[PDB]
Amino acid sequence: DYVSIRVSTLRGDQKIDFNAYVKINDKMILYLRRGDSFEGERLKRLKDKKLRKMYILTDEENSYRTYLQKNIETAYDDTTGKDIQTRADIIQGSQQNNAEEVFENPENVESYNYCKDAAGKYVNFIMSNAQALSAVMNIENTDKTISHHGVTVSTLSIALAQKLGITDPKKTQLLTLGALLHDYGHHHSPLNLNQPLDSMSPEDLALWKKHPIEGAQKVQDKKHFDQTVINIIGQHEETINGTGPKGLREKDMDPLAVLVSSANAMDRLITFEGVPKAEAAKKLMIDHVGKHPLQHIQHLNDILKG
Ligand SMILES: [Fe+3]
Ligand SMILES: [Fe+3]
Hints:
Binding site for Fe(3+) 2: 183, 211, 236-237
Protein name: HD-GYP domain-containing protein
Number of domains: 1
Shape: globular
Strand content: 5-15%
Helix content: 40-55%
Radius of gyration: 19 Å
CATH class: Mainly Alpha
Binding site for Fe(3+) 1: 149, 182-183, 264
Keywords: Metal-binding
Largest sheet: 2 strands, antiparallel
CATH superfamily: Hypothetical protein af1432
Bound molecules: fe (iii) ion
Distance between the termini: 47 Å
Number of helices: 12
GO molecular function: metal ion binding
Number of strands: 4
Strand order of the largest sheet: 1-4
C-alpha cells in the first residue's frame, strides 16, 4: 500500500510527481505534495525533524524511482552550469542514501558495489568542482545522523588526502567509501551521539567504545567488503599514541584509517560536541593530546576555513 523511501533522496529543485507521507502514531500523514521541491530554503521542510524514512504510495514508486535517477544524473553532470549548492544538496543526500542502504543490508553485494561506485563519482565531483567541498560543508547535520556524518567525514577525508598528496584513485575511492561507512557500528545503537565523549556517563562511554570493534566484526568476513573499508570501520577511533578502543598506535594502523580518524575527530567536535570549527584544531591538540598527526590537524583546519 505504501513503500518507504529515505528522506536523504528528496533534494534539489526537481518537482516531485508523487505524494510523501510522514508516519505519526502509525498512520501515514500527507506531508509533501505533488509539485513540491526542496532547493534552497525549501529544504528546511526536511531539516531539524529527525526525518529518516518517509513513505510513498506503492502506485507512485515508478515516479519516485525516475525522480531519483534524474536527480543524480543531472547533479553529477559537470556541463549543466546548474547551481553548485543544488548539485551538492542532491549528491550529499545520494551519498547518505547509499550508506544507509549498506547499513540496512550489509549482506547485499549489489548495494555495496553501488555505494562503492558512487564513492568514486563523489571523489570526482569534489575534485572537479572548485566549490563542491564548500557547498557540501554548507549542508548542516541538523539531526546528527551517522549517515550524514559519514558523508561529511568522507568529504573532509577527500580534501585531506589531496593536501597529503595521496593521488591513487583506487586509494581515494576506498578512503571515501570507508569514511562513508565508518560508523556502521553505531547503526541501531541506543547511544545518543550528540554529546561530548569526555562528559558521557560511564555506561554511555563504555557503549561508545564498542562501536568500531562490533562494526568491523560484523563485516570483516564479508568478501564483498574491501579490506581497506573493513580496516577503516574497525580502526577509525584509534589514535596515533595508542589511546583508542583497540589501543593501536600509528605503525599498527592502515594509513588510510589514520586519515579518517583525524577527519572524524574534527567533525565529532563540530557536529556532535558543538565546537566552533575554528577552535576544533586547538581542541584536538590540547584536549586530545597527541591523538592525531599535527599535519592532519593543520590541513583540516585549513580545509575548514577554505
Ligand atoms: Fe566512530
Ligand atoms: Fe564518526
